[PDB]
Enzyme design. Structure first.
Site, PDB file in Angstrom:
ATOM      1  N   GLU A 187      -3.226 -14.956  13.319  1.00 14.74           N
ATOM      2  CA  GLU A 187      -3.102 -15.731  13.953  1.00 14.74           C
ATOM      3  C   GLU A 187      -1.719 -15.597  15.206  1.00 14.74           C
ATOM      4  O   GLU A 187      -0.895 -15.983  15.887  1.00 14.74           O
ATOM      5  CB  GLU A 187      -2.701 -17.056  13.689  1.00 14.74           C
ATOM      6  CG  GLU A 187      -3.858 -17.345  13.000  1.00 14.74           C
ATOM      7  CD  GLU A 187      -3.258 -19.274  12.153  1.00 14.74           C
ATOM      8  OE1 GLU A 187      -3.262 -19.253  11.902  1.00 14.74           O
ATOM      9  OE2 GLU A 187      -4.103 -19.317  11.550  1.00 14.74           O
TER      10      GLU A 187
ATOM     11  N   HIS B 126      -2.417 -17.644   2.535  1.00 12.64           N
ATOM     12  CA  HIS B 126      -4.154 -17.346   2.781  1.00 12.64           C
ATOM     13  C   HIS B 126      -4.346 -15.801   2.723  1.00 12.64           C
ATOM     14  O   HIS B 126      -5.261 -15.371   4.252  1.00 12.64           O
ATOM     15  CB  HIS B 126      -3.890 -18.337   4.619  1.00 12.64           C
ATOM     16  CG  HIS B 126      -4.593 -19.663   4.754  1.00 12.64           C
ATOM     17  ND1 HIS B 126      -3.425 -20.789   4.078  1.00 12.64           N
ATOM     18  CD2 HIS B 126      -4.463 -20.162   6.092  1.00 12.64           C
ATOM     19  CE1 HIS B 126      -3.731 -21.629   4.847  1.00 12.64           C
ATOM     20  NE2 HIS B 126      -3.746 -21.149   5.988  1.00 12.64           N
TER      21      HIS B 126
ATOM     22  N   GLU C 102      -5.107 -25.661  -3.147  1.00 16.06           N
ATOM     23  CA  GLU C 102      -6.467 -26.009  -3.648  1.00 16.06           C
ATOM     24  C   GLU C 102      -7.018 -25.402  -4.514  1.00 16.06           C
ATOM     25  O   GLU C 102      -8.034 -25.024  -4.309  1.00 16.06           O
ATOM     26  CB  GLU C 102      -7.311 -26.177  -2.013  1.00 16.06           C
ATOM     27  CG  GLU C 102      -6.426 -26.747  -0.917  1.00 16.06           C
ATOM     28  CD  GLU C 102      -7.382 -27.122  -0.108  1.00 16.06           C
ATOM     29  OE1 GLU C 102      -8.628 -26.112   0.483  1.00 16.06           O
ATOM     30  OE2 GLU C 102      -7.223 -27.213   1.219  1.00 16.06           O
TER      31      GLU C 102
ATOM     32  N   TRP D 106     -13.623 -22.555  -3.863  1.00 14.81           N
ATOM     33  CA  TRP D 106     -13.682 -22.396  -2.495  1.00 14.81           C
ATOM     34  C   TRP D 106     -12.782 -20.950  -2.310  1.00 14.81           C
ATOM     35  O   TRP D 106     -13.646 -19.912  -1.607  1.00 14.81           O
ATOM     36  CB  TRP D 106     -13.702 -23.483  -0.944  1.00 14.81           C
ATOM     37  CG  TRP D 106     -12.995 -24.115  -1.150  1.00 14.81           C
ATOM     38  CD1 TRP D 106     -11.387 -24.237  -0.530  1.00 14.81           C
ATOM     39  CD2 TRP D 106     -12.478 -25.150  -2.054  1.00 14.81           C
ATOM     40  NE1 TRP D 106     -10.540 -25.131  -0.608  1.00 14.81           N
ATOM     41  CE2 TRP D 106     -10.837 -26.004  -1.750  1.00 14.81           C
ATOM     42  CE3 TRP D 106     -13.483 -26.331  -2.518  1.00 14.81           C
ATOM     43  CZ2 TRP D 106     -10.940 -27.903  -2.165  1.00 14.81           C
ATOM     44  CZ3 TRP D 106     -13.051 -27.223  -3.124  1.00 14.81           C
ATOM     45  CH2 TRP D 106     -12.080 -27.629  -3.113  1.00 14.81           C
TER      46      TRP D 106
ATOM     47  N   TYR E 121      -8.472 -34.349   2.006  1.00 13.50           N
ATOM     48  CA  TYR E 121      -9.937 -34.098   3.166  1.00 13.50           C
ATOM     49  C   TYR E 121     -10.514 -35.469   2.837  1.00 13.50           C
ATOM     50  O   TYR E 121     -10.992 -35.054   1.714  1.00 13.50           O
ATOM     51  CB  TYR E 121      -9.770 -32.772   3.293  1.00 13.50           C
ATOM     52  CG  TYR E 121      -8.789 -32.096   4.252  1.00 13.50           C
ATOM     53  CD1 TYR E 121      -8.499 -31.113   3.161  1.00 13.50           C
ATOM     54  CD2 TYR E 121      -8.906 -32.045   4.964  1.00 13.50           C
ATOM     55  CE1 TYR E 121      -7.105 -30.341   4.151  1.00 13.50           C
ATOM     56  CE2 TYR E 121      -7.483 -30.953   5.850  1.00 13.50           C
ATOM     57  CZ  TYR E 121      -7.276 -30.487   5.225  1.00 13.50           C
ATOM     58  OH  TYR E 121      -6.513 -29.272   5.517  1.00 13.50           O
TER      59      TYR E 121
ATOM     60  N   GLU F 179      -0.771 -31.297   2.701  1.00 17.66           N
ATOM     61  CA  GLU F 179      -2.331 -31.361   3.705  1.00 17.66           C
ATOM     62  C   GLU F 179      -2.520 -32.468   3.119  1.00 17.66           C
ATOM     63  O   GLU F 179      -3.252 -33.343   2.229  1.00 17.66           O
ATOM     64  CB  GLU F 179      -3.147 -30.166   3.637  1.00 17.66           C
ATOM     65  CG  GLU F 179      -2.324 -28.655   3.749  1.00 17.66           C
ATOM     66  CD  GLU F 179      -3.325 -27.840   3.680  1.00 17.66           C
ATOM     67  OE1 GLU F 179      -5.073 -28.271   3.660  1.00 17.66           O
ATOM     68  OE2 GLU F 179      -3.344 -26.320   3.293  1.00 17.66           O
TER      69      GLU F 179
HETATM   70 ZN    ZN Z   1      -3.161 -26.414   1.659  1.00 20.68          ZN
HETATM   71 ZN    ZN Z   2      -3.150 -21.418  10.407  1.00 17.98          ZN
END
Ligand code: ZN
Ligand code: ZN
Ligand code: ZN
Ligand code: ZN
Length: 337
Positions: free
Chosen positions: A78, A100, A169, A174, A242, A277
């Site tokens: 990114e 991440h 999460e 996942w 979400y 989030e």
């Molecule tokens: Zn998150």
């Molecule tokens: Zn990102």
């Protein structure tokens, strides 16, 4: 002057002040946060940190700026965010970065997505803790996060505080650090080991640490505590959620219920409660439902911020007296502690 108890007992004065700020601010407003605020957008012409979709919609930037380790750890897909973080901090914004991390057990096998990434579900917790064959791989990621944090300085050479959110999460499967990939104790060890490595082995002094599982449908403290790393290891209690674009009344009630739970736990434990989030065809009442549901609840209203990852709806959210955008927050980093 106020006394603050952080995970890092040697955290910088600005980092301590940020925590103190949110402790006060959280009962007077809910700050708006947005992932990739000034680096990604549908309406921006520059990605240099001077523009945002938020600013183009309402005339102000988000108060909380979210980024992730795809901008820090090689290969930095990114791109770097040092300049954009510095611009945000210069405006008095608050910075949060989520991990991440690629999969330490399979990251050399990259080619066909999602092999070797966060989304490669191959269990890698057991083999990346000390003693595990892939501990050096995980340490390489943490080394890069620490070097980045240790050199993240403002114009006076002072470190910029960051809310670092680890292994989010984790109650779903996942990600490689998920609930099918580790026992609760192994996940707690992964979180604790990583905080300890950054703070103690690499000397990071400008981080607040956040924990953020998914929303629970059985909203209990016992459920949140199953994989919770512990009060000695977490400064910020959040969650990620979400929902559906349609028929989302139940989902919004669940958002409020989870926010109320972390708010009550945060008050008991001396932490900052947040919605780390939240996100989703379109629902042009989504933001109005969100702020109305949260602020009406006596516990959920106490979250410091919510971070999102139709224009009229968002403009109404901005106009709401309980939402706070970047110009609505002041004296965040020089509060005496
Ligand atoms: Zn998150
Ligand atoms: Zn990102
Ligand atoms: Zn107050
Ligand atoms: Zn599960």
């Amino acid at each position: 002057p106020v006394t603050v108890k952080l995970v890092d007992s040697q955290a910088t004065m600005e980092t301590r002040s940020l925590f103190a700020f949110m402790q006060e601010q959280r009962r007077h407003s809910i700050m708006f946060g947005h992932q990739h605020e000034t680096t990604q957008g549908l309406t921006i012409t520059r990605t240099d940190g001077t523009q945002s979709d938020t600013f183009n919609a309402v005339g102000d930037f988000a108060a909380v700026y979210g980024w992730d380790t795809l901008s820090i750890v090689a290969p930095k897909a990114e791109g770097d965010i040092v300049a954009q973080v510095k611009k945000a901090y210069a405006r008095g914004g608050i910075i949060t970065v989520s991990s991440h991390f690629d999969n330490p057990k399979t990251d050399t096998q990259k080619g066909v997505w999602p092999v070797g990434t966060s989304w490669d579900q191959t269990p890698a917790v057991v083999d990346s803790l000390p003693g595990g064959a892939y501990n050096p791989v995980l340490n390489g990621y943490l080394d890069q996060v620490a070097e980045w944090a240790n050199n993240l300085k403002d114009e006076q050479g002072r470190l910029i505080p960051v809310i670092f959110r680890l292994y989010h999460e984790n109650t779903g499967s996942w990600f490689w650090w998920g609930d099918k990939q580790s026992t609760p104790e192994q996940y707690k060890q992964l979180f604790r080991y990583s905080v300890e490595y950054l703070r103690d082995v690499k000397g990071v002094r400008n981080f607040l640490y956040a924990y953020s599982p998914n929303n629970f449908w059985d909203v209990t403290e016992a459920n949140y505590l199953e994989r919770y790393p512990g009060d000695e290891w977490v400064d910020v209690l959040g969650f990620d959620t979400y929902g559906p674009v349609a028929d989302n009344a139940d989902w919004f009630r669940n958002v409020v219920a989870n926010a109320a739970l972390v708010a009550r736990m945060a008050e008991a434990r001396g932490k900052i409660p947040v919605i780390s989030e939240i996100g989703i065809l379109y629902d042009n009442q989504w933001y109005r439902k969100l702020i109305s549901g949260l602020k009406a609840d006596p516990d959920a209203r106490e979250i410091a911020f919510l971070l999102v990852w139709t224009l009229e709806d968002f403009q109404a959210f901005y106009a709401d007296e309980f939402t706070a955008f970047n110009r609505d927050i002041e004296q965040v980093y020089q509060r005496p502690t």
